[model samples]
Target: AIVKVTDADFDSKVESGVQLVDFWATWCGTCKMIAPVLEELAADYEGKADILKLDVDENPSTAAKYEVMSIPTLIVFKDGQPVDKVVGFQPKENLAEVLDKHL
Candidate 1:
């Protein structure tokens, strides 16, 4: 399942394994569009990976630290560091492929 992250705990949460962090906002249409896809991804990965969401509006520090200029910015973090990034809406299969590479 997806875990909601925040500026306070983002670093600690992503400090291990493969973490797909979704930087999103309630007002972002594309974020809403990709919500379900991420949900499915979370279920598929289960304990193999972590799917995290950070509300950009609520966690500006985390967003700015990553230089997230756009909504739905997905960053793949491995061992506490960012390794890959993608912006906008992406198909579930495309995301799965990305996660699989890290897994």
Candidate 2:
């Protein structure tokens, strides 16, 4: 399952280890397309890494800090720093490649 986090927990949750953060919103169309994709990825990464969600509408502070300009922004963080990111809709293979590269 994807962990839901706000700005309050951004440092604690995302700023460590292998973290995948999806910056999205409730009304975003592209976010809907990637919802299931993210869930599957979450399951695949269970115990290996962390998959998290931050609603732009509900959690503006964290979204702005990440400099997210679009919905469905997936960023891979390693050791508290953002290392790779895919913005907009993308194929699951592409996302897997990104995660595997750092895994």
Candidate 3:
């Protein structure tokens, strides 16, 4: 299951773990393409890392805090710090590469 992240939970959920946050909106075509990929990744890294989704439409403040200017922006955090970020859709291999480094 994909975790729904919000500003209220962002600090505890992501800032304290090895997390991958997908910033997206329901109507984004590119986000649709990436959703399944993120879900698959969540399952693959179930115990080793944390994967979550945040709806920009419903959680505007979180989106604004991240300065999310595009759909499907992926942010990787380690030990309460953001280590990497990828904006826009990415190939499965590329995502795997990013996670592999953290996991």
Number of the top candidate by TM-score? Answer: 1
By lDDT, is 1 or 2 better? Answer: 1
Count of backbone collisions within predicted model 3: 0
Q: Give the per-residue lDDT digits (tens) of candidate 1, residues 14-83.
A: 8989999999888899899999999999999888899999999999998999899988899999999999
Q: Write the per-residue lDDT of candidate 3 for residues 2-99, one digit (tens) a residue.
A: 88988888887876658888898878999999888888877888888888888988889988987788777998889877889998888777987998
What's the distance in Å from true for residue 57, model 2?
1.1
Rank by lDDT, descending?
1, 2, 3
**Per-residue alpha-carbon lDDT of candidate 2 for residues 6-86, written as tens digits (9 for 90 to 100):** 888789887668998989887898899999998998888888889988888888877888789877889999999999989
Report how far off residue 87 is in candidate 3 (Å). Answer: 1.6
Go through the candidates in order and give each one's C-alpha lDDT: 0.92, 0.87, 0.85
Worst 10 residues of 3 by lDDT: 8-17
Candidate 2: lDDT over CA atoms? Answer: 0.87
Return the lDDT, model 1, position 58: 93
Candidate 3's C-alpha runs over 4 A off are: none
Give TM per candidate: 0.97, 0.93, 0.91
Query: Candidate 1 lDDT (Cα, whole model)?
Result: 0.92
Choose 2 or 3, whichever is better by TM-score.
2
